[PDB]
Amino acid sequence: VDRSKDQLYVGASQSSLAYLDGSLPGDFGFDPLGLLDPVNSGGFIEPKWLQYSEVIHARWAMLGAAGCIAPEVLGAAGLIPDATNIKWFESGVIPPAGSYNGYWADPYTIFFVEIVAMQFAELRRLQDFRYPGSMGQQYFLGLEAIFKGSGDAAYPGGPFFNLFNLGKTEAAMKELKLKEIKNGRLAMLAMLGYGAQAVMTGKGPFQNLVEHLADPVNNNILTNFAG
Amino acid sequence: VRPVWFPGNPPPAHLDGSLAGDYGFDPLFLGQEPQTLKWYVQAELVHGRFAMLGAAGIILTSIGAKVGLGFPEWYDAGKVVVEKNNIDFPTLMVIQFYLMGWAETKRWYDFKNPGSQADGSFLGFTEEFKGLENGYPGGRFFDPMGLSRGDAAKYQEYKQKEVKNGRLAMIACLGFAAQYAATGKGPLDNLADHLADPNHVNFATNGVSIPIA
Amino acid sequence: GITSELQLYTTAIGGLVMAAAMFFAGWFHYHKAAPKLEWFQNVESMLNHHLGGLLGLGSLAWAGHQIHVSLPVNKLLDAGVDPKEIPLPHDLLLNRAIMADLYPSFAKGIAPFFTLNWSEYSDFLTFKGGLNPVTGGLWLSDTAHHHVAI
Amino acid sequence: DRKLWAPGVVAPEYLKGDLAGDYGWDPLGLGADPTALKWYRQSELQHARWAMLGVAGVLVQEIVKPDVYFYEAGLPQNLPEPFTNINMGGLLAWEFILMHWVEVRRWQDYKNFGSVNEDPIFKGNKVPNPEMGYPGGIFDPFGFSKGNLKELQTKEIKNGRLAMIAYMAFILQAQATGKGPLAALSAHLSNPFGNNILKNIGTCTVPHSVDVQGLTIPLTCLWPGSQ
Amino acid sequence: MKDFTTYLSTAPVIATIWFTFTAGLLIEINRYFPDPLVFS
Amino acid sequence: AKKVKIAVDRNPVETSFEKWAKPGHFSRTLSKGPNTTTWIWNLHADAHDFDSHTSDLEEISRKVFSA
Numbered sequence: 001v002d003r004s005k006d007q008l009y010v011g012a013s014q015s016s017l018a019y020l021d022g023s024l025p026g027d028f029g030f031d032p033l034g035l036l037d038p039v040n041s042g043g044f045i046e047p048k049w050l051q052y053s054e055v056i057h058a059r060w061a062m063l064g065a066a067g068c069i070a071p072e073v074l075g076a077a078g079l080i081p082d083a084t085n086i087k088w089f090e091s092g093v094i095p096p097a098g099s100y101n102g103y104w105a106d107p108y109t110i111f112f113v114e115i116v117a118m119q120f121a122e123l124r125r126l127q128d129f130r131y132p133g134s135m136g137q138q139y140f141l142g143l144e145a146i147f148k149g150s151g152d153a154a155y156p157g158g159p160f161f162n163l164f165n166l167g168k169t170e171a172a173m174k175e176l177k178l179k180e181i182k183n184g185r186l187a188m189l190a191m192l193g194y195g196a197q198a199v200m201t202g203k204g205p206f207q208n209l210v211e212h213l214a215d216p217v218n219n220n221i222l223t224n225f226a227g
Numbered sequence: 228v229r230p231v232w233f234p235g236n237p238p239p240a241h242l243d244g245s246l247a248g249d250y251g252f253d254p255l256f257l258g259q260e261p262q263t264l265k266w267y268v269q270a271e272l273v274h275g276r277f278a279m280l281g282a283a284g285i286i287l288t289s290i291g292a293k294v295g296l297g298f299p300e301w302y303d304a305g306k307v308v309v310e311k312n313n314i315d316f317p318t319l320m321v322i323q324f325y326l327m328g329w330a331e332t333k334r335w336y337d338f339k340n341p342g343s344q345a346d347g348s349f350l351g352f353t354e355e356f357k358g359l360e361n362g363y364p365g366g367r368f369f370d371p372m373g374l375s376r377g378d379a380a381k382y383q384e385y386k387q388k389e390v391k392n393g394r395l396a397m398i399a400c401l402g403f404a405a406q407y408a409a410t411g412k413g414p415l416d417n418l419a420d421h422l423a424d425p426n427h428v429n430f431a432t433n434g435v436s437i438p439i440a
Numbered sequence: 441g442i443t444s445e446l447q448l449y450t451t452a453i454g455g456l457v458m459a460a461a462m463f464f465a466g467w468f469h470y471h472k473a474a475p476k477l478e479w480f481q482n483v484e485s486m487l488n489h490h491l492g493g494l495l496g497l498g499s500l501a502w503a504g505h506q507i508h509v510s511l512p513v514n515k516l517l518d519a520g521v522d523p524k525e526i527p528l529p530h531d532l533l534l535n536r537a538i539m540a541d542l543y544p545s546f547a548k549g550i551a552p553f554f555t556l557n558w559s560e561y562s563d564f565l566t567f568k569g570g571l572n573p574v575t576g577g578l579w580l581s582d583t584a585h586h587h588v589a590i
Numbered sequence: 591d592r593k594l595w596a597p598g599v600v601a602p603e604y605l606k607g608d609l610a611g612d613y614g615w616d617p618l619g620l621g622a623d624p625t626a627l628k629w630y631r632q633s634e635l636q637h638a639r640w641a642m643l644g645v646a647g648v649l650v651q652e653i654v655k656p657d658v659y660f661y662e663a664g665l666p667q668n669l670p671e672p673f674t675n676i677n678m679g680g681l682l683a684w685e686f687i688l689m690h691w692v693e694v695r696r697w698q699d700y701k702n703f704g705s706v707n708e709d710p711i712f713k714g715n716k717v718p719n720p721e722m723g724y725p726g727g728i729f730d731p732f733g734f735s736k737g738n739l740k741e742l743q744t745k746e747i748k749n750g751r752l753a754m755i756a757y758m759a760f761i762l763q764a765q766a767t768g769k770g771p772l773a774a775l776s777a778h779l780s781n782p783f784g785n786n787i788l789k790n791i792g793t794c795t796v797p798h799s800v801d802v803q804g805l806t807i808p809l810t811c812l813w814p815g816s817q
Numbered sequence: 818m819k820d821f822t823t824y825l826s827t828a829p830v831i832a833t834i835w836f837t838f839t840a841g842l843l844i845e846i847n848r849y850f851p852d853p854l855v856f857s
Numbered sequence: 858a859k860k861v862k863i864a865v866d867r868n869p870v871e872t873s874f875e876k877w878a879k880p881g882h883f884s885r886t887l888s889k890g891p892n893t894t895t896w897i898w899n900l901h902a903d904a905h906d907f908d909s910h911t912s913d914l915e916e917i918s919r920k921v922f923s924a
């Protein structure tokens with residue numbers, strides 16, 4: 001996967017150029033396994049679902065990448081009490097790695113609210129993919145006015161999801177989508193970096209960066225194989 | 228058009244909204260056959276109506292227990308009533324099935340042959356057992372106030388109210404059983420505990436509902 | 441390395457979930473997304489995945505279990521430790537200190553693997569042969585090196 | 591042509607400047623139903639008018655009686671000498687009876703506009719009630735309604751909206767810092783950097799519960815602050 | 818549902834239910850009246 | 858040089874209990890129903906003989922994969 005920008009990436013192949021025509025955001029021709037070929041597609045391996053899933057992964061990853069390091073950066077700057085300067089994997093998500101006592105409820109009590117809240121958010125989002133525009137019809141406390149969608153599942157738009165109606169022009173919107181995808185793809189790799197770095201070193205993402213800057217040669221992946 | 232249990236999913240063909248409380252919820256297509264749907268429509272109402280009596284009775288007696296009037300919990304009333312009043316349980320059970328058997332057999336053969344119980348055979352009563360709809364007896368015995376014989380628009384509104392309070396009562400009666408099994412305390416004993424510390428006293432912390440907790 | 445009926449119980453529940461997944465897959469790949477004939481005739485592709493993917497990764501994955509779960513647990517069981525007092529498999533995985541006590545090679549991490557000092561792992565990747573005198577079965581350290589080689 | 595809440599944002603169709611203080615702001619689209627918009631407009635007036643009295647009461651009460659600490663002013667023992675330790679049960683009885691009458695009259699006006707203008711006891715008395723929520727008449731003895739009524743409505747709602755925000759600032763500041771609005775303002779001036787939200791946000795100074803003449807009343811902060 | 822109830826009416830399904838019922842009745846009788854040899 | 862790729866057909870068959878109530882549907886010979894007891898044995902003997910139900914290799918492969 002060619003880093004940076006370019007017309008085509010390293011893995012671009014003549015076979016993938018058949019259907020990759022630049023219509024999708026961040027379409028750099030990289031599809032060595034040819035999972036986006038329209039011909040004889042079905043199930044979840046089809047262009048509409050795979051492109052939709054990438055954006056959803058991009059947006060969750062962007063929140064995760066910024067949220068898995070902010071407590072360490074803010075804690076390092078003294079803007080939050082040291083009691084909350086906690087590594088992302090020691091928040092309580094993985095109790096064996098570490099858990100934080102001091103939340104207003106037991107982490108399982110909080111999880112049930114997460115289940116119910118995400119059931120509504122995710123199943124309503126799904127129903128717009130299966131039946132476009134269907135969430136703007138049945139009464140939902142008057143909120144159905146903002147759930148009418150825009151025909152494209154990954155980009156609902158509307159009064160809320162496009163609060164400040166940025167990208168009014170077609171050219172402007174394409175650039176914003178490209179910027180969203182590149183930041184999202186970068187964050188997805190960052191999250192994978194957090195997970196791999198946590199296992200290899202056992203420290204937070206911020207600690208690894210600080211140590212690397214201290215002695216870059218003596219602190220890197222190669223030296224962390226043994227300690 | 229009309230709201231459904233799963234927004235965005237078209238309602239089933241066999242559920243057209245004519246029935247009360249119809250939200251097009253039949254994922255297993257149990258009532259696809261029209262004649263079987265009549266049987267279940269009445270089964271739901273009988274289940275719902277009993278649950279409403281059960282829930283109201285359990286709630287009221289629980290309030291009596293908390294206030295200290297001496298009522299036993301719903302899960303101990305049966306033993307207390309029999310012993311305190313010196314009642315032979317097998318005799319009381321038999322009496323119940325004679326009265327329920329007679330009353331409920333009449334409802335059974337009105338479903339099979341509607342209007343058959345209003346032929347004057349039973350003590351000469353010829354109009355109190357005719358029946359209005361499936362599951363809605365009507366008449367001046369089951370509906371003495373004639374709220375089903377007055378305004379037609381409001382009577383349809385009540386049918387909506389009856390089924391939804393019935394479904395809510397049915398869920399509540401399942402809550403009473405599940406809560407007692409998990410906690411071993413009365414209904415309002417659980418409510419008092421939750422109000423004390425809602426964050427730290429609920430099903431996620433009882434040590435039973437979520438074993439991995 | 442199974443030491444409690446809870447561990448047996450969880451596998452049974454996982455077995456039923458897999459059974460449900462298998463029946464869903466059969467329904468899905470016949471009634472919903474059925475592969476075409478040209479798909480079934482990629483014999484070269486099928487062998488590649490079944491050799492390196494099914495047998496290959498399956499053997500490597502099981503070697504991971506033996507190196508991290510079976511070997512430590514059975515080393516203590518043979519020593520006479522009460523089963524209830526043996527460390528749980530996840531404690532062995534999270535605490536490299538415990539593993540170092542049983543097998544000192546773990547004190548060096550995975551650096552020997554990448555530096556080709558594979559002889560460092562001689563303590564748990566053995567070539568003894570024969571039968572374990574205490575239990576009368578093959579050495580599990582021999583079995584781990586078998587599945588790593590395979 | 592009116593200015594909107596944000597630059598270059600399209601106002602909703604149903605918001606066309608008819609109502610006062612209309613910036614075309616409705617991200618949740620709660621005004622889509624015309625009947626719902628009327629009801630929400632009334633509640634905005636109620637919150638706006640009650641909030642303005644609330645802000646004025648807190649500020650004026652602080653100046654006249656600095657030590658009362660309005661947050662605790664509800665306790666019977668803190669009442670003025672004539673009403674000190676009054677039976678709260680009887681005190682509530684007056685409010686329920688009097689407010690139930692007044693509010694049902696206002697409610698019936700919304701249900702059937704113009705029905706409840708006339709006095710029930712003394713025949714002949716009436717209020718103009720030019721618009722719903724603006725009874726006028728006896729409610730406007732000085733006759734400011736005459737003239738540019740539209741401008742006055744704009745002034746009322748804009749000040750009222752500011753009061754709503756301002757009052758909830760008083761509540762959160764009292765919960766976090768334990769001081770009234772003016773007292774907190776003085777504290778910030780003394781030590782602008784040491785004493786600010788960055789430090790006080792983590793503490794909730796409200797006791798778990800209070801005993802009012804033998805009746806236990808639960809209390810809470812608006813966030814899970816460190817008690 | 819009509820077709821599904823038709824499937825349950827097929828000979829193998831009926832026999833399984835019928836013998837499951839018949840066997841259960843005999844098993845239960847011998848659970849409450851163990852070792853019956855003479856009518857008595 | 859036919860490329861190696863995923864290839865499927867969408868909704869090839871409908872999920873219904875209709876054919877569960879029509880024994881022998883898979884075979885032309887047995888679809889007419891029984892006249893002698895020999896039909897019953899023929900139903901179970903030929904149930905999984907996919908290659909004889911249809912001459913289409915694709916249909917045969919799909920049944921094998923799901924079976």
Ligand code: CHL
Pocket residue numbers: 660661662663664665666678681682685800802807808809810811
């Ligand atoms: C605008 C109205 C209003 C506001 C904003 C406050 C605000 C406050 N009062 Mg005050 N009061 C108000 C009106 C009144 N208070 C009192 C009497 C008291 C007392 C005696 C006390 C307070 C206290 C408090 C605090 C409560 C903190 C809390 O979490 O309470 C909310 C807690 C709740 C349990 C209620 C939350 C829900 C909602 C507000 C009530 C809704 C009730 C329904 C109408 C009930 C309907 C029942 C159904 C079955 C029909 C806070 C500073 C306490 C204080 O100073 O603490 C330091 C205190 O001790 N107030 C009276 C009687 C004259 C009021 C009459 O209108």
Ligand code: CHL
Pocket residue numbers: 324325326327328329332333336348349
């Ligand atoms: C051949 C016999 C015969 C049989 C098997 C039945 C069977 C039945 N008849 Mg009956 N009938 C029979 C002959 C006749 N019936 C009728 C006329 C009717 C009518 C009109 C009705 C029945 C009904 C019924 C059913 C009642 C079900 C139930 O739970 O009852 C429970 C039984 C009782 C509650 C009564 C018996 C209680 C107990 C054994 C005796 C107690 C006596 C004491 C004095 C009690 C005192 C207590 C006080 C002091 C507190 C049942 C299927 C009813 C039905 O379901 O119709 C759809 C019904 O409405 N029958 C006539 C007259 C023409 C008959 C003539 O031979």
Ligand code: CLA
Pocket residue numbers: 041042043044045461462464465468469473475863864865
């Ligand atoms: C013999 C096994 C088998 C085979 C050969 C296939 C083959 C196929 N399946 Mg099917 N499938 C199977 C089992 C199988 N499936 C099972 C058991 C299920 C139920 C869970 C499904 C559910 C399923 C769905 C829902 C879909 C397919 C699809 C496909 C097609 C594309 C598959 C692909 O590219 O995957 C590549 C794999 C991925 C993209 C996912 C990788 C990660 C998965 C989720 C987990 C893998 C776990 C791994 C093996 C072990 C990890 C160990 C450890 C780290 C925990 C292809 C015809 C798709 C289709 O029809 O396309 C046209 C499709 O939509 N399958």
Ligand code: CLA
Pocket residue numbers: 063064066067068070071074080083084085086091092100
């Ligand atoms: C996917 C996103 C995500 C998730 C799941 C988490 C999860 C977590 N974060 Mg992280 N975080 C994220 C993104 C995320 N974060 C991002 C993007 C940032 C950078 C901005 C941060 C910055 C951050 C910090 C600095 C801290 C955390 C912490 C936490 C933990 C505690 C959460 C908590 O107490 O919330 C509290 C809950 C809420 C904020 C939601 C309130 C919900 C109520 C009902 C709203 C009511 C609204 C009201 C009525 C009206 C509006 C009022 C308003 C105008 C004032 C938890 C593990 C804390 C931690 O690790 O503690 C040990 C911690 O200190 N996160």
Ligand code: CLA
Pocket residue numbers: 463464465466467470471870871872873874876877883919920921923924
């Ligand atoms: C409820 C879901 C469902 C439904 C309604 C259908 C419906 C249909 N399927 Mg599909 N199918 C499903 C699930 C379903 N399928 C699943 C889960 C799979 C994966 C295995 C398949 C795989 C599949 C294939 C491969 C084929 C069908 C076919 C059919 C058609 C006829 C099936 C028939 O006659 O079955 C009646 C058959 C049975 C009731 C036998 C059940 C056998 C199962 C596996 C249980 C085995 C138990 C075992 C013997 C226990 C030991 C016995 C011992 C103790 C004595 C029909 C359109 C056929 C078709 O379309 O032909 C044109 C066809 O070829 N289906």
Ligand code: CLA
Pocket residue numbers: 093191192194195196197199200500501503504505507508532533534535536539545546548549550553561588
């Ligand atoms: C498939 C088999 C397998 C597996 C799974 C493991 C696994 C492990 N081995 Mg073992 N090992 C194996 C085979 C295996 N081994 C074999 C064959 C040998 C013989 C050569 C060894 C020899 C060996 C030694 C000598 C040691 C280990 C160790 C380890 C542990 C740490 C490895 C490490 O440093 O990773 C470094 C980093 C990674 C593996 C990358 C992790 C990537 C993560 C999962 C990405 C997550 C991303 C995701 C998006 C983030 C979550 C987000 C979400 C929460 C929202 C680990 C549990 C070490 C240990 O601790 O032992 C107790 C150790 O010292 N192994």
Ligand code: CLA
Pocket residue numbers: 079080081083084102787788789791792793813814815816
């Ligand atoms: C993503 C945001 C986030 C999240 C989820 C948390 C979560 C938590 N914080 Mg932290 N905190 C944050 C950001 C966050 N904080 C920031 C930015 C600051 C600096 C103002 C602080 C300062 C702070 C303190 C001083 C304390 C906590 C504590 C807590 C715990 C809850 C109890 C409490 O009193 O919280 C109070 C915290 C808040 C109300 C912050 C809400 C932040 C929102 C959700 C994000 C938007 C803020 C916005 C940019 C405005 C900032 C201020 C403004 C003047 C510029 C919990 C672990 C407590 C703790 O450590 O308990 C052991 C505690 O005492 N936090």
Ligand SMILES: CC(/C=C/C=C(C)/C=C/[C@@]12O[C@]1(C)C[C@@H](O)CC2(C)C)=C\C=C\C=C(C)\C=C\C=C(C)\C=C\[C@@]12O[C@]1(C)C[C@@H](O)CC2(C)C
Pocket residue numbers: 615616617618619620636637638640641643644645646647648651660661663664754755757758
């Ligand atoms: C009524 C009110 C306050 C009343 C206070 C009173 C009577 C106080 C009385 C006393 O204090 C005294 C004087 C003295 C003390 O000793 C005693 C008490 C008794 C304590 C505040 C309302 C306060 C109300 C507030 C803050 C409301 C804010 C609403 C917002 C921002 C809504 C925004 C949007 O809904 C829109 C408009 C459109 C959508 O599309 C988008 C979103 C974003 C959803």
